[PDB]
Amino acid sequence: MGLEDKVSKQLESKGIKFEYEEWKVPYSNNQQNYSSHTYTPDFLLPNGIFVETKGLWESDDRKKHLLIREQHPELDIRIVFSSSRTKLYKGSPTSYGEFCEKHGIKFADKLIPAEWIKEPKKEVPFDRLKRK
Amino acid sequence: MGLEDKVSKQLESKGIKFEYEEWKVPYSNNQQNYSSHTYTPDFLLPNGIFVETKGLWESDDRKKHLLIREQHPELDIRIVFSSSRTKLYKGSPTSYGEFCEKHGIKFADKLIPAEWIKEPKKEVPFDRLKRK
Amino acid sequence: MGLEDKVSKQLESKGIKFEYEEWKVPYSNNQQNYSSHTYTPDFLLPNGIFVETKGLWESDDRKKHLLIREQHPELDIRIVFSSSRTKLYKGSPTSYGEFCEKHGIKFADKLIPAEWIKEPKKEVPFDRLKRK
Amino acid sequence: MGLEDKVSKQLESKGIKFEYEEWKVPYSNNQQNYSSHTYTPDFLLPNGIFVETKGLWESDDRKKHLLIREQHPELDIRIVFSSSRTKLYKGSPTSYGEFCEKHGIKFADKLIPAEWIKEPKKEVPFDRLKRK
Amino acid sequence: MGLEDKVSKQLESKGIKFEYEEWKVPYSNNQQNYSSHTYTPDFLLPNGIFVETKGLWESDDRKKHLLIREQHPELDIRIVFSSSRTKLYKGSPTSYGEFCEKHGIKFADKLIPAEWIKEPKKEVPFDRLKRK
Amino acid sequence: MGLEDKVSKQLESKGIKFEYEEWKVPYSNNQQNYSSHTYTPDFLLPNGIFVETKGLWESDDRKKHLLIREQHPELDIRIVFSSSRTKLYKGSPTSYGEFCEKHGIKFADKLIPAEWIKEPKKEVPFDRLKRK
Amino acid sequence: MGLEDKVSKQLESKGIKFEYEEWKVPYSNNQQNYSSHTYTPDFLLPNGIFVETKGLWESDDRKKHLLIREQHPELDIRIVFSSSRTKLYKGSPTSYGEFCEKHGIKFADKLIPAEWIKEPKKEVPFDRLKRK
Amino acid sequence: MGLEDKVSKQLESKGIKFEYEEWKVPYSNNQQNYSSHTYTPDFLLPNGIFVETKGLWESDDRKKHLLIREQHPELDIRIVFSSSRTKLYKGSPTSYGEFCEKHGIKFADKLIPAEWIKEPKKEVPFDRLKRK
Amino acid sequence: MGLEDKVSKQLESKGIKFEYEEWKVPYSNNQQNYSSHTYTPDFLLPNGIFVETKGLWESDDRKKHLLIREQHPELDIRIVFSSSRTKLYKGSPTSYGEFCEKHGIKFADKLIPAEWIKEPKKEVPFDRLKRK
Amino acid sequence: MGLEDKVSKQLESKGIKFEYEEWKVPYSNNQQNYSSHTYTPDFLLPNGIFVETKGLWESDDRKKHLLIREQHPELDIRIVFSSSRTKLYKGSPTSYGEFCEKHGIKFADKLIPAEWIKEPKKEVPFDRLKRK
Question: How does it assemble (chains A, B, C, D, E, F, G, H, I, J)?
């Protein structure tokens, strides 16, 4: 390279004992791959609401939930738990419920609340969805 | 499913007509992949300063220089441009130099400032480094 | 309620003439009201980069962009301004470009940079998109 | 468009095989979608102070409050918590009260302070309100 | 006052020549009176949109507009100007238009844009309004 | 009206059926009235320190003390409480002292700290002050 | 003191060659003087508005203005610049106008707006003010 | 000024009965003074660290430490209290320890941690200091 | 130098009794050493996760962790606390758990979650890592 | 530790082939060193102010001024350049003047402002200084 070379020459002219393309700096490049996936709620109420029954709620499941929320604010996806009191990880002070309150997720225990069922209808962008 | 069953039965008991796992919600998983690579500075001065000559500076090149600054603070890496007055893109008001200034990247034009070569020697962690 | 009755009790005893749940405060919210829309970028490069040529870029087209970004992080969308030098509005110290830089939106001026065109190809989830 | 045609021109000449306005990005917004609602505080004192006795105060009843505030700055609404000591959610360093203080919401515990009752009377725009 | 007196005595006991309720500190107390008022748009389009014709646009008029926006986000009130180019105050660099863009107000010159008229209908809370 | 007329005629020309100034939008004008008053500290020590005794500390009292701190920084005003351990409201975790600490209000209990009385004399702007 | 002795024996018990209360670290403690001062606005219209004409307006005069603003919120003081277009200082993307806009300072260009002069009179706390 | 003249002239032609420089606004600007004060750590460890033991930690001394950190960043001064638990003041919801963490001050309880004792030496500018 | 001479004559031309290049203001310039270091995680599961057990965990160990995090983003390092319930430090409203939650650090209590152990393996950059 | 032991035990019973303290993570913590350096203002005005004239203002010296401000807040050091317009560096969109305003440094062009010359005296700690 002209510039690269002109520079080495500059160093050589001053009798500078430098090192040429000898050392390498190890670093890790974080690529962000976006893999596209699908998530199917368990029940779709007539009023447009979506309900997901969940017994055990893994970290994957949670994150994925949150992703679905960020990317699709037009959807109402709520979770019915067997025990909203269950703790995220054994020994942890945080439950499925709390974590739900935190990121504002509507949830309930054992059965879909009558309130939810009786809620005023809202359009669901089916065209945006993919049926099974 | 257990809890699932119960829910669906609840729904049927109230005669609510619902859709059972009919639709899938598409979403993309923002995966952060971390691949790893090496960066080889052009010259290593006797005082410990690493210098990279650079005619044309690309986008990748920039990000890359930035990852390294974060992942390797101990290392002193500087750029020497054919022209720091060059723009990142056609019509772009922002220039190489402005950019490096904006990120704390010491740089210069055409040749290595004698001042650089005169700065007091500093240690270099050859251990953390690999060779060619 | 218990707290409610306690509170109404203290007041009653104290002889505080007061009104219980008599008035309703007319208020409004847009919480669960997301109307589905579409945004057709101007160009789609093979490597997958979307380009949106914009003359005037008002404060609303800005909101829409940040919006579409959050909802579609899997897509690469940049802007070719007629002038990134333009201020958010006459009377602002900030320009279109500076906005884009702060918000990490890739942009160019008048024409689509060659660098962009020569970037390494990445996938595009056409399913998640509707074709005119 | 001119900019649009210029951009498509450069690309055409350069031989860049590209797609012009072919795909639409399904996105969503709640911009102009405000559903009208009502909030009935629990008590209305003669001096005009509204009091809302609240046991559990979740992260949503919070949003509604700040909301109703902005929209009705002319009204005086305070909260009698069963416990302002409660944290926003188990796992938070912040409590109900501290939230209220930061956001400038007047609050008491268990009972309506006498001080409140004895404050100097101020008008109330009953027209702007619907009575149950 | 017991405490007040106990303190003076304390000062007297130490033969401290202090001054008693002699000086006053002048300060101004800013009361926030909320006067309730009304604002009548000039035209109400069938699609729920409100339009206000405006020739001259005083500071009062502006502020009031903004108030109406903050307090009633459920209403669509737009302004048709004779000259959106007119400057706020003579000599000023800011126009009715710019000020409009700034606070995101939809405006137009001389006539209601056909686009506006053709916009998709939206409910108007008449019950919330007061007719003339 | 002129521009008004034109608009309405435009509307009629397209046969659009509109409502002409039919409804008024109610809103409250947040007026900031600035009344002015005086504050009379209980004692003025020979060193320039103003002291206010205070058994029970009300809400008005607090705000008032705060206006003065802003409007009159030069003046050194301190409170002496019968009990700084007292709460602002029943059940309130927050106490007088905590409050003054939170706002930089030097205070003390029962009696004037001899340390105060011992602090070096500072000027007092009697000019800016009024007498009784 | 106890802690000192417990700490010095600990050191000594380990044979730590330390230095005991040997060196004095110098520094400078600061207090704040308050010089009473006065600012004479240029004009005082019949409605109360105080107008101050201004050509140059450096950071120094600006600060003093904001200061006066804090201490005297009850006063309406506007500025008539020879040119609000003049930047705060050479190089700044900001001007006197924008600065004032951001700080709530009501400003104008060349002459006192007819609008100001018409605004409905409001009382002035001449008590708080000193006459020339 | 020319601006002053012009402004009044326009005021005159319109016949506005204004007041020219007839009133002064009393405000108080505050100057800052400095005291040549001196501090004195308790112990001076071989590795440079200055350890100061502290029983009751007055907010005053708390200020000094803040100053010294700043004024002498070349010095390492840590604190060892009889209790890093003690609260800043009566009823204080904050402990000395919290204080030090908020400002980056290294502390310890009862005796000097061995980790500190073994910490690597670092020059101490005895010239910038004074001997007892 | 020119400016110096122009400035000194100006002073002299006014008869200003000033002092010329007489005093030297002392200060301390700082550089930053970089000591290469290493941290040995406690366990390394088959899927890549590095687990580090922890009882006490003071600000010092916390910082080091965050540091390691910055420099080595490609590494999954979690912590198993004896009790995440333990506050960062006495008095803090925060605990090890919440701290980690806020900082993205994946933590657990008492033992290594079965979930972690099941997570799908991911590559480790052993190049970047040194073996014991 | 007991925690370490327990964690591995559970790992063992489940039969997880893990690696105990088998890998070190190379990271680099950086220490901070200080140089006893000395600065020297150009002129020392009677009122205390130290005026330093400056032609080309290197970013290096820019750092020093920052340090000195901090390390010696008891001193007033201002700058007079041959141009407060000059840019920090080649292609720099920032002027020396801007620099000083961002850090609160008082500057002037060509000669020392008379305002400075007439500014009220303030002690100068000649003891904390050294003579040329």
Answer: Homodimer.
